[PDB]
Design a protein around this ligand. Sequence first.
Ligand SMILES: CCCOc1ccc2cccc(-n3cc(NC(N)=O)c(C(N)=O)n3)c2c1
Length: 264
Amino acid sequence: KWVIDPSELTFVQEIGSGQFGLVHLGYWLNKDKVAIKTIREGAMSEEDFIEEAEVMMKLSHPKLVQLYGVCLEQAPICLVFEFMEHGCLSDYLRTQRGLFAAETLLGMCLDVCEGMAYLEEACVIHRDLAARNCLVGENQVIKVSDFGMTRFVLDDQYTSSTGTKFPVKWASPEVFSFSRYSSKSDVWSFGVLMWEVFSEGKIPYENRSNSEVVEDISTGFRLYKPRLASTHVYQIMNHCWRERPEDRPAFSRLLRQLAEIAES
Ligand SMILES: CCCOc1ccc2cccc(-n3cc(NC(N)=O)c(C(N)=O)n3)c2c1
């Protein structure tokens, strides 16, 4: 089942402090080494989350971080994930800047695109795909995490398109205008993620306010080609940033296109 009893978990070492609380390296009884995320009370709609657990726990892919279960006996609840030794992709790119071969950066995009094609096939919309949400594991494999989690986030400043903390930098126009989420709006976010990877972790639209990003995108501005991205890779990024969702490629199409470039 998705319920993990407190007696089936041991907390070993604090590894960090996330949005909802602390992250620990620990062990899960008779199973494996895990990452345990403690969720502050009031951060999430726990009842809505728990309700979807039996169905959503079944999602599994080598390029998705597995969320094994929830320890909910007492508050604050804990989420139990597969352990990702090298942490988040955004920090990994920034710390290893200047040491990446262009083929490795393309490979990182392919790992994310593969996990996203699995979600697209399963009709699961991420809603906030970014390098900060991707994790780096054994042999520098990239896996997507936190897909669909903004549906449970109780801070309206992050979830509402007009919210002060709304992740506008990764939002397609129909998302930033109407919260019209789809795999095609995840494709737009994926294009921004490809730019974060090829820029070795630079912040997209670093020089702009949320309203300025909205005004720039609406008038045709697009993120500049990173030095490490080839013109062919940049062409794929721009396809992700087409104004109409219908004109953007599906992740299934992007995966075939990016693989052809990687294996050529
Ligand atoms: C506690 C068992 C998992 O329960 C849920 C419940 C609701 C969910 C709603 C959206 C997405 C979920 N979700 C998130 C996951 N992984 C991750 N790294 O974020 C998984 C998975 N199967 O690995 N499922 C959910 C997972």
